[PDB]
């Protein structure tokens, strides 16, 4: 009874970063050696744990947050970081325990002419709390005037697409990111190596 | 008066999307984020220069 990593890492479609998808992993055996030694990931950074010891640990629950961002934003998926993703789309706590895994998807999520299906939040009233998901589409008021539901001078729809094109430079290529949050607060432990 | 800068930078990246230049648009979007965190108005000039290079 292995954990459904295939449903997380080999999903047909990933969520937009503004509306990241959280998959609950429980009541299973997590064969983490499959992911670590796949050599298909560009990023595999663990916090609070080394990747080579994951096979020897049990967790209460594991939550896999999946989304697509651009290459230059991969560094924002980390504790202590800031930026439009870290602040308005997906914030990780300073005491985060888990692993951040990312890989280039220029041959999946990019299309000729540009793939505009993926969105990020550019405008928000304030910074997100750790693991907060804000999917409101209410028009942002940047200026002194009320918007009252109408876009215009200093009133903007909060989301902006990523135009992922196959010819974009590396920092602008799409990356599929999966963050595995490890609940290591003691309990019966439903996820084991 | 600061508000006019935000509107102008915004319009530039929206225009770039319409020209089929997504990378340039993404570069400008970063100027919007930085602008709204700072008093640095030279970001408008950069956005304008990026548009001129694209056109
Ligand atoms: C994610 O999928 C890859 C690729 O899976 C293969 O190709 C698919 C299109 C489909 O036909 C699958 O049934 C195939 O297995 C997995 O990578 C493979 O993993 C196996 C087992 O470790 C290995 O023997 C193969 O050589 C790997 N192939 C490649 C190209 O790397 C990958 O393990 C899957 N990830 C997860 C978490 O399940």
Residue numbers in the entry:
A (entry chain B): 334 to 526
B (entry chain A): 1 to 55
Paper excerpt:
Cao et al. designed small, stable proteins that bind tightly to the spike and block it from binding to ACE2. We set out to design high-affinity protein minibinders to the SARS-CoV-2 spike receptor binding domain (RBD) that compete with ACE2 binding. Unlike antibodies, the miniproteins do not require expression in mammalian cells, and their small size and high stability may allow formulation for direct delivery to the nasal or respiratory system.
The best designs bind with very high affinity and prevent SARS-CoV-2 infection of mammalian Vero E6 cells.
